[PDB]
Amino acid sequence: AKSKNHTTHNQSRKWHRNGIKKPRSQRYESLKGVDPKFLRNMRFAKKHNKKGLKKMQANNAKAMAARAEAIKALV
RNA sequence: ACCCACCCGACCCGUCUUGAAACACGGACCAAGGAGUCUAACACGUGCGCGAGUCGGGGGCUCGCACGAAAGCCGCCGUGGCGCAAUGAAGGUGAAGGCCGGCGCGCUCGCCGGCCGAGGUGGGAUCCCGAGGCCUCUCCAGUCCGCCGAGGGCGCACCACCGGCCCGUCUCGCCCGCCGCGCCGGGGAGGUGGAGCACGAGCGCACGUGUUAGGACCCGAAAGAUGGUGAACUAUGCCUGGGCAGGGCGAAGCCAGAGGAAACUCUGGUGGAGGUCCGUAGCGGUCCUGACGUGCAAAUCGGUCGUCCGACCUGGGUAUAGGGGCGAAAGACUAAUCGAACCAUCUAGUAGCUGGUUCCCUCCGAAGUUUCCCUCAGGAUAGCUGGCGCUCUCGCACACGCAGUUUUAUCCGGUAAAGCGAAUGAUUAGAGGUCUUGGGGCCGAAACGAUCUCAACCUAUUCUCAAACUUUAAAUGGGUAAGAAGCCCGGCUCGCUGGCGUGAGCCGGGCGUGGAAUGGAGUGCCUAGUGGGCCACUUUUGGUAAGCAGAACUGGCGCUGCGGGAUGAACCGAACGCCGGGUUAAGGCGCCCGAUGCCGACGCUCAUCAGACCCCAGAAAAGGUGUUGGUUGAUAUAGACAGCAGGACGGUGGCCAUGGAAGUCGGAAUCCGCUAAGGAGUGUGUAACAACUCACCUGCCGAAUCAACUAGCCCUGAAAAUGGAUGGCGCU
RNA sequence: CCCCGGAGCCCCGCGGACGCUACGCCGCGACGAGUAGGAGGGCCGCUGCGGUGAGCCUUGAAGCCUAGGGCGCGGGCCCGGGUGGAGCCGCCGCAGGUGCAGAUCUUGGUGGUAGUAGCAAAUAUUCAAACGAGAACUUUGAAGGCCGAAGUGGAGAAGGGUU
RNA sequence: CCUCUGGCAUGUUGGAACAAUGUAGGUAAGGGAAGUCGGCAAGCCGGAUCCGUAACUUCGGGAUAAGGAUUGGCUCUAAGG
RNA sequence: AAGCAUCGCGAAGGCCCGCGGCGGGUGUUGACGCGAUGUGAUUUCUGCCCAGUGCUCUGAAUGUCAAAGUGAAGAAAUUCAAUGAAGCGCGGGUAAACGGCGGGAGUAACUAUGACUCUCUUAAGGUAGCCAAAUGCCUCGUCAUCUAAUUAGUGACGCGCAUGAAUGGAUGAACGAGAUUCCCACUGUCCCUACCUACUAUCCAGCGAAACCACAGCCAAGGGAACGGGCUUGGCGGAAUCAGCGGGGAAAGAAGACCCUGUUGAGCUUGACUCUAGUCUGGCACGGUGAAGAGACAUGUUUUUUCACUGACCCGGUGAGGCGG
RNA sequence: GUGCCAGGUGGGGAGUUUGACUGGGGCGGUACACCUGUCAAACGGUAACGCAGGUGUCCUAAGGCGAGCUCAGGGAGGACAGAAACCUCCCGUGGAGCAGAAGGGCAAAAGCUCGCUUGAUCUUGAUUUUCAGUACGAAUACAGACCGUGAAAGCGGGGCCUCACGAUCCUUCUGACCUUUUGGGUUUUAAGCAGGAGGUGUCAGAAAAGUUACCACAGGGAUAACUGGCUUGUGGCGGCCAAGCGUUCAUAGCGACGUCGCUUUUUGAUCCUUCGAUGUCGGCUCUUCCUAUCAUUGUGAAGCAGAAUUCACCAAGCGUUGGAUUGUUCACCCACUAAUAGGGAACGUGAGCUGGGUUUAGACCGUCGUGAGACAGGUUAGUUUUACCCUACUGAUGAUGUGUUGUUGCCAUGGUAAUCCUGCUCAGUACGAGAGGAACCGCAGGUUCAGACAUUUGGUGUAUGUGCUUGGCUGAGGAGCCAAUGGGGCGAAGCUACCAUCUGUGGGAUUAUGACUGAACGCCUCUAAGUCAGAAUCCCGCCCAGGCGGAACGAUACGGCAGCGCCGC
Ligand SMILES: [Mg+2]
Ligand SMILES: [Mg+2]
Ligand SMILES: [Mg+2]
Ligand SMILES: [Mg+2]
Ligand SMILES: [Mg+2]
Ligand SMILES: [Mg+2]
Ligand SMILES: [Mg+2]
Ligand SMILES: [Mg+2]
Ligand SMILES: [Mg+2]
Ligand SMILES: [Mg+2]
Ligand SMILES: [Mg+2]
Ligand SMILES: [Mg+2]
Ligand SMILES: [Mg+2]
Ligand SMILES: [Mg+2]
Ligand SMILES: [Mg+2]
Ligand SMILES: [Mg+2]
Ligand SMILES: [Mg+2]
Ligand SMILES: [Mg+2]
Ligand SMILES: [Mg+2]
Ligand SMILES: [Mg+2]
Ligand SMILES: [Mg+2]
Ligand SMILES: [Mg+2]
Ligand SMILES: [Mg+2]
Ligand SMILES: [Mg+2]
Ligand SMILES: [Mg+2]
Ligand SMILES: [Mg+2]
Ligand SMILES: [Mg+2]
Ligand SMILES: [Mg+2]
Ligand SMILES: [Mg+2]
Ligand SMILES: [Mg+2]
Ligand SMILES: [Mg+2]
Ligand SMILES: [Mg+2]
Ligand SMILES: [Mg+2]
Ligand SMILES: [Mg+2]
Ligand SMILES: [Mg+2]
Ligand SMILES: [Mg+2]
Ligand SMILES: [Mg+2]
Ligand SMILES: [Mg+2]
Ligand SMILES: [Mg+2]
Ligand SMILES: [Mg+2]
Ligand SMILES: [Mg+2]
Ligand SMILES: [Mg+2]
Ligand SMILES: [Mg+2]
Ligand SMILES: [Mg+2]
Ligand SMILES: [Mg+2]
Ligand SMILES: [Mg+2]
Ligand SMILES: [Mg+2]
Ligand SMILES: [Mg+2]
Ligand SMILES: [Mg+2]
Ligand SMILES: [Mg+2]
Ligand SMILES: [Mg+2]
Ligand SMILES: [Mg+2]
Ligand SMILES: [Mg+2]
Ligand SMILES: [Mg+2]
Ligand SMILES: [Mg+2]
Ligand SMILES: [Mg+2]
Ligand SMILES: [Mg+2]
Ligand SMILES: [Mg+2]
Ligand SMILES: [Mg+2]
Ligand SMILES: [Mg+2]
Ligand SMILES: [Mg+2]
Ligand SMILES: [Mg+2]
Ligand SMILES: [Mg+2]
Ligand SMILES: [Mg+2]
Ligand SMILES: [Mg+2]
Ligand SMILES: [Mg+2]
Ligand SMILES: [Mg+2]
Ligand SMILES: [Mg+2]
Ligand SMILES: [Mg+2]
Ligand SMILES: [Mg+2]
Ligand SMILES: [Mg+2]
Ligand SMILES: [Mg+2]
Ligand SMILES: [Mg+2]
Ligand SMILES: [Mg+2]
Ligand SMILES: [Mg+2]
Ligand SMILES: [Mg+2]
Ligand SMILES: [Mg+2]
Ligand SMILES: [Mg+2]
Ligand SMILES: [Mg+2]
Ligand SMILES: [Mg+2]
Ligand SMILES: [Mg+2]
Ligand SMILES: [Mg+2]
Ligand SMILES: [Mg+2]
Ligand SMILES: [Mg+2]
């Protein structure tokens, strides 16, 4: 009593009932499996972003004032 | 709705199965009975109550309970359960951070005051603000009401990402603490394991589905175990009783007579031995393979047989009992039961295996493939199914994303083909080459001397090949990409990287349709059946082949009716709510049978076996002046072609072959003369000739003639057993 | 430039269905094969319980039968007539030992087979009479037969248990 | 096998026919195992008296070996107490 | 089965039962007996093989071998040591124990066989006998005989697939409901069938079952789960029945004995795995008295060896009848 | 001795086990865990007991660096030295080597030779490959240590890459001033935590021998042993071609090397059907079909003079026998014959038989097995059920119709029958050198088959006919009876036998074939239109049955109630 041994006959059909969906792409994928030495350093960089805040805020206010002067000169 | 008629349709259900009207099983008929239950445990969903709680048990207080064995209440209301905290094997430890100011050297470390208090990015239903319209019976003013709303905000839930905190663990480090300064205790930085925290969601009750444990959907073993009953049958022992015609053979002992010298021997009697013979009753049971075979009989009957004074037959009593007895041993017998009796129980024993499994409509609707399994008639796990949803989207003039497509870019490929004067391997032929050298020759003493030769090698060529070769190289095919998660500016962070710079991560602005066609998307939980398959196109391996076995690809059948294919799983057409009209497909249109009952068109073909439609149910090589087309060549007025009539020679017994071939078993040759012209000969035949026969030309007759291929129909090739099938009748 | 308790109405913002069991009612499109399997709805069906129908019932309940009348796609249902002779149903809830064609199913019943197979072992019966409703079979008589003293005869044992 | 003593009514029925198949009996011309797996089945033989008796042998048997003849009825004779 | 032949046992024994007993059977017995096996009267034989597996005999000369006991170190649990029973090993016997019993080459003044020789080999290498046997594949062996004809029968032959000596060989009168072959007789066995009898079957009166049963019942062909009663296409089809018949209903009978599957069994086997009654050995206990001596350690202890003793314990006898002084 | 422990022995006894896949199973293999090339249809992925192979290791270097070299092969040289020793020059895309299979990869290397070495070390996660996208193994990229090597850049955490390996439990070793060893403390011990090792090859991992013919149970047509299907290799039969054979001559008869077919009376494949059973070989008996024709009829051919013959055509009407051995099929032999052709029907035919053989159980022998047991090795003994149903067939009553009845008839359709031989004659003739040796027409008979019949012969005989005879019984005689038909002679009638006797017929159409006239094709041709002869064939005749088919004719209900036939209206 020998069987059928293997096949792939009805399988494509079976797969395509429910699509063959592409793998759901997000923005902001994880940093799992990224070269450790990198990840330390981007972690440290992220740690000290709040250091150098007061400088950054002022720079944007100076930029915003320069934009407001430019738009007044245009109008 | 009862009966009858007629036309068309129409095989018997159930079931296992790839496939059932089956020569697969179950089913004579009717009634009643008859199979997914209950308990427990889990999980998810749903409904209700309360909610950081919830809870009810168990107990108690209220009644003789009619209704109550209820109902109510309880600092027991919470002992306690579950929940509200984890993590570590454990000793144990145990979920906060930020900011600001100050003091220690701001040392991305240690200590003291103030403020905020569960971080941030992107997307987010929804709210909020809202420039601005858009009018009002006039020109302006102008509060009220809307409608829309560009633009901008707070952003639930949820998702993705990055930070953070707790426990385990590692690595590196530097400080704090005190009743006990210690092999004491506490912290930091950076990874990494945790069923964690990051303003809670549980508890109880109820219903549903699923999964289990239980007799566990219902029915079914062969077995296993405990405790009992039987020797009235039969097996063997023992006790006490009963039973066995008539004949044959004639053992020991005995007598007489005769012989013998003795030993003893003969002859005639008598005698009546024996697991002796015949043969009755008895006991048995050979053959007829007789009778019977739903019997007279759950083993009988008839004849024929074996034995019939002995290991004989036989009554009653008595002994031996179940892994035990008893056995002249056949695994025989042990109450119609024996390769382990019977009875009751354990027991509703177990069953991956048969069988069955009860009303209607509606909607969705499979699989026979995965990996694992003492797995291959079963499970597990993926897959395919359903159910419950949720989150968003906008036809409410104002859309994003997704696809069994295609387009434009761009990579991938080594199959078909092709190639072998390219590699690898195979392989033919001759040219050329003392390449090498040989082995065999012939002419050489021998000599790359001359001449051949065959070996391998080589120089150009040449024949033919490859699933496990290839320089080339398709078609079909597989990725990506075709924008807001995108571009373009400005600035900050780094313990990484570094002459300066990289690269990454952060903030803050600035810019909108970015190929065709179509379509509303996303997302989570429970989840059944299935895990025997088969069939066709094309591709394809094994095999002589198979209605054989095995893959790929799509589509079928299985699950599925309907028109066609006469008939039919699977072919072709087409996929079904119940009906009227119309129109089609694939198929048809002599009659069966709806439609050609057309003045249908043009050919082909006659068969003493005609032929007549995918799958398909049947023929080949090879033949045929049968007939019809082609193709190529001829021929012929220098009047042919056939049809009849006249000659077929000589050089020449040509040469090889003698065994005879002067043309003639065969073969190398193979030309001249006469010529009008005859082959050194097509055959007949001869031992060998001879003789005969087979061009070139005329005479007659009077226009086409003839050859070789080729392909259409038809025919030969063509033989099977019940009588027979283009479906039938038939048809020219 | 006036008020609908009155414009008279194709729109009426003063009040609003014949319609509105909002688990209702209505409108537009599309679609409809189905085993195994899943889910939904059943004013389908059975039996019992709490409610409820001032239900039904000897002026006839249940069941049974019906070439009667109907409804529903269907599960089924309702009426008429007959039969019967004592109980029974509708609705809202709850509960289940809840729906059969099959199981070589269980128990009971009934057919076809069929007036069929069959009533054939062991030689044998006949005549007259009696009784009697009735005689192939009883009894009596007569004849013809068999068992043929290892008996189909005459007596026990065991077993039966009144034969 | 037939009879007396004693006992029965032909074994759970009767009648009418006399087909095929059977079951149980018989018989067959000529041949005689040609039949058939095989003389299965049936047939031959059979009592008694008188003769006659092989191979072989465990000397006992074989042995009713085989093979032959006779057998009735009647009327007498002889022999046995 | 008689006959033959092995084997165990002198009774605190052999063999065996039993759950247990100062239990029981053999046994009311004693080797001319009890118990266990083979072979199978007589006659005549009974070859070789002790390598294998069995069984058995011996046993400080001795490898291993348990618990207890002895010593050792350790705080102790302990470990280590020496000691050392049967059993295995080690060494003898045993085949009327299971069983076993060869293969190459060459060789004789015609050829052929091979007396003879040469090897290689085992525990021996099949002896006497016997044979195509109930044992021989090839096989219907070859020769003879028996028949007209013989895969049969008999007699011979023997590199015998794969004979063979109490796994008994060869024989053999008598006997056999045993297996064959031939001959004589006899026959319906047959050529070749026929006629007769009785009881049936038949028809009737009375009486009266059963199995079986989806529906049913005329064929050919087709297709079809590849042999249809039903379907397609053809042939066709006429009530109700009687006696027969065995073609068909793939007729009935019985959930296939075969075969295969099942993680279903049972009977039996053993070199399966895991145990176990029984048995053999060692230890401790009931277990005492005396003598003697002997080693080992130590400078008393332990081991005890042998020889007595009787009081436990046992056995036998008896109507416990005379015992010791 | 008993009690209790210890070790041995212990199929006497118990319990249990005795894989899987598999063109049924068993035997054999391993396709059971891995790897290469192919299969594979140019992404990947893919099957079979597909193909060709490899694996259970090997390495202290064959691992890691760095340096330097260049390999196979060939040419040309050089004392001994030759095809091969050593040296030297040239060419050399790798044709070598790189542990092993193969594939890839590799030249100032991944090869060889040196120098120094232990990156084959310690430790987190991520990823790939198998994948369920779990494990194992194997690998990839990092990251942190500590090293190696190199001037350095770098490379290196095993082997250039693709295979070489193993869970839970248990053990063992290594590791930390580690945790626990529970009323506390110290110490041994044990228990944890983390990493290696001891193995499961049936490789995601039970601990495991047979036998059963004394057997059982659940099932299976998922699967064998028949038929039947498909196929036809194999067997059987038949073409085509034509090198040869046939003295000569390819083809009278043959036919190599090649080739194309049919057949399912061979055997295989295969497994579709049947395992809630389709009775498993042979023989007997009986019917029917096929033809691939042995004989018989009619014919063509010859290497046919005659006789004998083989080759072919129409053709299956009619035949195809008796025995010996064997269970046989098959085989062989004897005999006859005209001939002793071949098959089919579920390998026709078991409710038809038989049962000899296969194939239960009883037994023997050989070989095999320790044994239970085994043996397409031999032997012997071994239960063959049921029909009354339906159909089919056989015969038997009937049926509807015709007004009823009877008569004598016709005939639709079915069936169907004759066969072959000898002798005589032709005739010792044709023919032939002879040897030998036919035929047509006649005539006489016989075989097998069919249909009858009984005068005769035979058989039967229960006329229970008539004798005769046994045993018994009616007292005897006479007359009888009984003994399942007492026995036996003879035997009427009647059945009945190649065991007696009789009878068995004629046409038509044509087939194969051979011919006519005669074109096609100025001739010739059997043919194309036309015509002839023609047969065991076929159809009818005769012969049998006689239709839900008819025919002519007869009589048609006196009656006691009757009832009808015509005619006309
Ligand atoms: Mg499968
Ligand atoms: Mg099944
Ligand atoms: Mg099947
Ligand atoms: Mg069905
Ligand atoms: Mg069928
Ligand atoms: Mg079944
Ligand atoms: Mg049935
Ligand atoms: Mg019911
Ligand atoms: Mg819930
Ligand atoms: Mg679940
Ligand atoms: Mg359950
Ligand atoms: Mg049960
Ligand atoms: Mg058991
Ligand atoms: Mg019998
Ligand atoms: Mg009968
Ligand atoms: Mg009777
Ligand atoms: Mg048993
Ligand atoms: Mg049950
Ligand atoms: Mg299973
Ligand atoms: Mg759905
Ligand atoms: Mg490829
Ligand atoms: Mg190619
Ligand atoms: Mg299955
Ligand atoms: Mg298959
Ligand atoms: Mg199915
Ligand atoms: Mg539907
Ligand atoms: Mg369903
Ligand atoms: Mg009453
Ligand atoms: Mg109830
Ligand atoms: Mg019912
Ligand atoms: Mg009757
Ligand atoms: Mg009496
Ligand atoms: Mg009688
Ligand atoms: Mg009577
Ligand atoms: Mg009686
Ligand atoms: Mg006779
Ligand atoms: Mg014969
Ligand atoms: Mg014979
Ligand atoms: Mg006899
Ligand atoms: Mg004799
Ligand atoms: Mg012996
Ligand atoms: Mg020995
Ligand atoms: Mg043996
Ligand atoms: Mg010998
Ligand atoms: Mg004979
Ligand atoms: Mg002999
Ligand atoms: Mg022997
Ligand atoms: Mg001996
Ligand atoms: Mg022997
Ligand atoms: Mg049928
Ligand atoms: Mg029949
Ligand atoms: Mg049957
Ligand atoms: Mg079965
Ligand atoms: Mg069974
Ligand atoms: Mg299994
Ligand atoms: Mg068992
Ligand atoms: Mg063992
Ligand atoms: Mg056992
Ligand atoms: Mg298997
Ligand atoms: Mg591809
Ligand atoms: Mg280098
Ligand atoms: Mg290397
Ligand atoms: Mg590193
Ligand atoms: Mg303490
Ligand atoms: Mg046996
Ligand atoms: Mg067997
Ligand atoms: Mg036996
Ligand atoms: Mg099958
Ligand atoms: Mg020639
Ligand atoms: Mg077959
Ligand atoms: Mg049958
Ligand atoms: Mg023919
Ligand atoms: Mg047959
Ligand atoms: Mg039959
Ligand atoms: Mg039979
Ligand atoms: Mg037999
Ligand atoms: Mg037997
Ligand atoms: Mg009858
Ligand atoms: Mg007288
Ligand atoms: Mg009598
Ligand atoms: Mg003609
Ligand atoms: Mg004519
Ligand atoms: Mg004629
Ligand atoms: Mg006729």
Query: In angstroms, what is the span from residue A20 Cα to ligand 23's centroid?
Result: 29
Residue burial A36-61, b: 16+ Cβ < 10 Å; e: rest: eeeeeeeeeeeeeeeeeeeeeeeeee
Q: Which two tokens stand for residue A1?
A: 């009593």
Sequence-distant (6+) residues with CB within 8 A of A42 are A31
A52 alpha carbon – ligand 41 mean position (Å): 116
Taking the C-alpha atoms of residue A49 and residue A57, their distance in angstroms, rounded to an integer, is 12
Widest pairwise Cα distance in chain A: 93
Q: Which two three-digit tokens encode residue A23?
A: 């793998």
Q: Are A31 and A39 in contact (CB under 8 A)?
A: yes
From residues 10-69 of A, list those within 7 angstroms of strand F by Cβ: 32-33, 35-37
